[PDB]
Symmetry: D2
Subunit: 387 residues, 4 copies
Amino acid sequence: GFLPHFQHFATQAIHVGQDPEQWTSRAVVPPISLSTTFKQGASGFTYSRSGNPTRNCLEKAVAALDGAKYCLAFASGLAATVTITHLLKAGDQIICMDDVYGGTNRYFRQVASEFGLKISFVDCSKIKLLEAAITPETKLVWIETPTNPTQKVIDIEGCAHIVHKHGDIILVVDNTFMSPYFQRPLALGADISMYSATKYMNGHSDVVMGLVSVNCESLHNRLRFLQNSLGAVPSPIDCYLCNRGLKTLHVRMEKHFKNGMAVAQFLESNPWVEKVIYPGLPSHPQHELVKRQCTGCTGMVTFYIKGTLQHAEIFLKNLKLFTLAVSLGGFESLAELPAIMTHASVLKNDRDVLGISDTLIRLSVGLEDEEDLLEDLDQALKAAHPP
Amino acid sequence: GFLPHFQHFATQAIHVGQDPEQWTSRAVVPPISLSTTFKQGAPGSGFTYSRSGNPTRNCLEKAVAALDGAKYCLAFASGLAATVTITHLLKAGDQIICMDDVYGGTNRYFRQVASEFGLKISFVDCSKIKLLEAAITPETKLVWIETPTNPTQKVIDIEGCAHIVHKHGDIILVVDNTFMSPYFQRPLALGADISMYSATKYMNGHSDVVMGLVSVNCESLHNRLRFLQNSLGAVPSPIDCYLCNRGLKTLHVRMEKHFKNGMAVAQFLESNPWVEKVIYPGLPSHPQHELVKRQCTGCTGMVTFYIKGTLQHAEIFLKNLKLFTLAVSLGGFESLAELPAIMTHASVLKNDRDVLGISDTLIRLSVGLEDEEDLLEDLDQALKAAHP
Amino acid sequence: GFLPHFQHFATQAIHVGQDPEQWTSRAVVPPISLSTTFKQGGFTYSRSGNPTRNCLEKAVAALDGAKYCLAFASGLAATVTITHLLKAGDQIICMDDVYGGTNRYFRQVASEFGLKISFVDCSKIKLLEAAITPETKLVWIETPTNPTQKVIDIEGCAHIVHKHGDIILVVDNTFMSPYFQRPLALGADISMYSATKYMNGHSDVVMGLVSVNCESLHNRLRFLQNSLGAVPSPIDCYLCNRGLKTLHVRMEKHFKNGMAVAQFLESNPWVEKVIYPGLPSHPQHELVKRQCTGCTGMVTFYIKGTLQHAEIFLKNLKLFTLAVSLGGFESLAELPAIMTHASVLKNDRDVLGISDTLIRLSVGLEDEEDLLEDLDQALKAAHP
Amino acid sequence: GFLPHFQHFATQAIHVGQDPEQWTSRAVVPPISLSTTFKQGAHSGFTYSRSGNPTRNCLEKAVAALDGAKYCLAFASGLAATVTITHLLKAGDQIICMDDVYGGTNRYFRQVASEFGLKISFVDCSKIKLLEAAITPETKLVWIETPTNPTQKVIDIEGCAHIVHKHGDIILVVDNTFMSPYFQRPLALGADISMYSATKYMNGHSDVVMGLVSVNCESLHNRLRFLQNSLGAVPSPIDCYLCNRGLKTLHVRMEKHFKNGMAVAQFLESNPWVEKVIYPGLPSHPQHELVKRQCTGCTGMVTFYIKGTLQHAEIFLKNLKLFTLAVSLGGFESLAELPAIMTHASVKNDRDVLGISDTLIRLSVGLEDEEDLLEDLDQALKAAHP
């Protein structure tokens, strides 16, 4: 009952920007151009930071996958976030989601706010509340869906709609969790589709990178200027590796879905799980919303284990397939306790409100055999709660 | 008559951070660790996430720190990324004093971007010390200088400048040491708070890495920078870090050849009848030549000069070069030539270049590591081509 | 109706050799160790062994259901190394329809160091036994063949070969990959790969792989790996190991797309004949289901008309790229008579069925519609 | 009194094959081309990576210039180059190899090549009349090393070339690994093949295993080019890039290796705890005067015998703090090693004849500061003989 899959995604991920006629060798795979500078004198490239062959191939590919006209690659997701924020002036205000990635939370609240920028954390799941926070000084709205890690889902089309009623306000959707294979914020009314390519996009846990796709011509020109002016650019080798990862994004995300769905269903029917949060499950508060704006779900499964902090640790330390580590979206399965780990960078009084207790566990289900993933979870839960 | 060369420089560039006991394999060369994340909570722990820190980047930072005579170092995605990150130390309401002649991008960030966030920017000629003193306010938190400047190669008394800045209040002096490199100049040893590099140029020296480097001694200053490195995320690729560290292994023998080639080129151009004026710190004709010898252990391959005539004559010269490549950037093993007014400094107002002297006949050369004989031959023929 | 999929395959492909506890940093992904040498006072020299290559070798061995595996600079390099196992004076029985370079090595190079090479149709149970001599020490087979895709019953072949005892049976398992076929589980002594194809699967690594169970065979192979020095780069090893991580989800899509392409071509009025193991029309379709867990993306077909029609078709493709090699994420198309099998003598090319009208497709991971639409449009250009 | 330095070396090492007009982007440094295959149809271009590819060709084009050669072939390793060269022959032919060669070179000929109808004779080619006594019409290949590994015996290449080429068709190969093409050009001295282990000085950064073969003869190149593609011991394009990158600083590296190597050699000879030093740059070297005629300088390879027994050699090696106890050579880092147990353990009765005793130590002097390298040796020697 999900949105129909995007019509040329696999084809484009493999060929867009990859045209062999670009190179004198007619190579089927684009060469890695490390060169910082390029010969001028008799069009073309001037300096690597402003633009370079391998990065441009990647940006054109990602643009296509987002259904965008333009895309910009960055040193990291946070670097992309910071660059986007530099679009504004001293005196402007940013409305940010209350449950956001810790680093995003940290930048807005602790760094950006001390340069004449106003920051308001607003529950944008309450779309009725967003309008109340909007002021004539609001220039940017930052949204993330699903949120990390409580995975609450936001109506992008509804939010874009509220935001665009008051003229020049920018709507940014952090699309790190889903990827453009499952969700296209720009097609849903967003102005900017932002990624941490470090996660699902690259999908191989070996590249730190950010991506920003956009349609507005003037917004692109401002973003392209800041990309070269701030210089938070990615390595050409990282660009190549990420572009290589995109080649299998469609077949990777499908297995994440199948494995994620299977893990979520196993966990929900398990007597030692208090509650499971997974958009693909009917038990999810926004399951029907997900189906309207998304073409599927990922391998990100959040759940509460029964008992105390003690049980969550025994569970995590007895896993043999899931690796106890931060980050997500890789081919390998990851497990994590946000209260102590990825979201220790979010205030304690805010964690109590968001639901990040000592028993909330975030899983990044990988591409291993389903059987083995379930068996690993079963054995580990039995370690915390033995027969 | 230059400052004596820094001791153990080559030894440290090859060994610091490269210690084989870090790895289970006892490899002589540090592995490239691409992994974005790391396993936590195991029986019997340093790394958590690549952006915060990772093996290959850390080895590079420890090595560069040593070459700078520093305690700490931070690597970044680019020189500009390093610059922007440093500026994030400040608050809305602070003022930045910047050298009047600096790299266009440094100029551009301060004038067009930093000025959009409650920061006041004044461009001041910091070589003339009275101009700096009048610009300092109780609100001043940052002074950004570059020496030699890009591309007119103006030289600033670093130790003298630090003395003025560190007198009244908490003001940070940053020295963009891209041109010289730590082999020839140590700003931290001269009183600067930060020695900053674009590793894209001489540090890596192989024209295949875009990267910035930031060296510092102050403990609180480092912690604020280390926070911003992870919080802003302008991080370099581990593979780029490896390549740059590899470039460092030959930094000492490269810079020596850059010097020897650079001096010969400067001397050739100044005696050439088709050249109006040469600016090179190694030449006694440089207004601050004796200052250079007091602050440096030598000079690099950056040679700036004026060709006789107008813009048309400069173009014919540049297009006739066969070894020098008409291109932007600098500090690589290959020789580069460029016209700053139209190229690297087109992002500087037309009215500022005339004040700074960046006319249409000003040419910047980045002399590489090719044979001396051949580089002179290329310059000679091209000058004969410009004025036949 | 195929053989059941190999158990724990995806799990092993992602985790075997990838243990974070190997590194002081506990990185989830193994670092690329370029270091040629190591401090002594473990590893000694990169060519003999190194962390990144060794991690890859443990992974491939598991996927093969093997005890050992050796990585090499290329597929041919792996073949040459294996051939160095033999003695002066011996004979090699090699299939008549093999990869061109394999043919060339045996016929033009290997034969000159006291090695005798006889090309034999190893599918004919009576032709193989007649070719075996007490002097034969090595039998080299490839299944399915390139590009006529002839299929060999491996276990009976193993059974026939091992009756004469110490003879090595090598199966070039490049086409299928260890995800779809396990020669070692079927009685082969060596499972050999060109990792340049499906194993890496991203058209950016040249590498060979050799899997083995026998202790004595391994020690001889390991000695030769270090002695000839046709070793792969650690970065290539990393890249191939990176590619292995998605082998299971890639091969499944190659299967789904290849099947769709094969079926489209067969019902097409401008195609004379389609050769694809996944189609019931393939003469050994049922043998495939008994020894394999599925099929790959290699689709061979004859276009109606002449060489001219095959050329018009190939040059009008917009998604398929006219190029050699195979097994990458991108779709490739090729005319073996003129291209990849130009290194095989011409009159044997005619007997094998590799005419001027035989076309080989390597179907990639693109969308099915676009692949089919591209084929339709290109066929309509040849035959409007 | 050495040969004048080869002219335009720095220019060529930096520019040959590196022409920015090769790429549509006009990049100053050649891109790394990983692609295994190339689009065909529209004469122009590449077909398959193993046969040839942009990045490998640029390196080969570059190395050829530095060798003063017309052609060059890159391989997966030095040994890969060796095995490929040997494949030029047939069963029944005979190979003349230097008596003191690298352990792996010895091992291949003796244990592998010898099992395929090849005749192998180990001959002291520094005494050149021994070369003539072993030559037979069955000789198709002469493999020499100068200086030898690790006793550093020096061979008159042109003299050998004269003797070898007098008789029908014998190929003379010079393993020019120790010296660099900056310091020695075998092809200009009459050799048929200039071969390298690029793992050492050529790359010079201890992170690439690679072999190189430079050649002038047309038929010889065509036969080798066939084998490069047919045997498939090809290097990775990224490794090719890395070696080409290392090549950019080869001249300034080799000069510093020389200055450090000479100082290290001079220090050891004046040291009361060293019995004998073997270094071509030293007048005490038997072929010192020969070296000056065929070379433009010397490298950082210093071989010496320490006084005492095996235990004294161990304490010395284990007390080094700058020199690293490891195998291989030619990198920016200083290496120290005991060949009898390590790099030449694959050669024992032959070690005794060659002089590779339990007290023979081989040093690869790196690019560190001279003083620091000297102090490390000084302190470590004081440690063995306390």
